[PDB]
Amino acid sequence: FKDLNLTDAQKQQIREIMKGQRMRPLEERRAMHDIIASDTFDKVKAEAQIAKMEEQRKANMLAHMETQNKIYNILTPEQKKQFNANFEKRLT
């Protein structure tokens, strides 16, 4: 919870970080839908969908971690302590 006292130069540095981180769900939700609404459950078809979802997850996590890392490294040492304490309290 950005209680980090962000500097105005930090506020805009972050805004520029998000537009870049330092980039096939609909394709994914669609395939999920077709698995759920089928008369039967086909395990091998589901496993192929789960594998396809790992691709997208990989891209999304990489982008999310690199972004959060870029933000961490614009912080002052006191602000990094608060970032780190906040991290302990969030789940995502």
Label residue 5 left, alpha or beta by phi (over 0 means left) and psi (-120 to 50 means alpha).
left
Task: Decide which of Cl ion, Zn ion, none touches 89; Cβ closer than 5 to 8 Å per partner kind.
Answer: none
Q: Which range of residues in 12-20, 25-33, 57-65, 73-81 is near Cl ion by CB under 5 A?
A: 25-33
Check residue 43 for interaction with Cl ion (CB under 5 A).
no
- Residues numbered 25 to 54 that lie near Zn ion (CB under 5 A) are 33
Contact 70, 17 (CB under 8 A): yes
End-to-end CA distance of the chain, in Å? 12
Phi, psi of 41, deg, nearest 5: -100, 120
CB of 68 to Zn ion, least distance (A): 6
Q: Which residues bind Cl ion (CB under 5 A)?
A: 29-30, 33
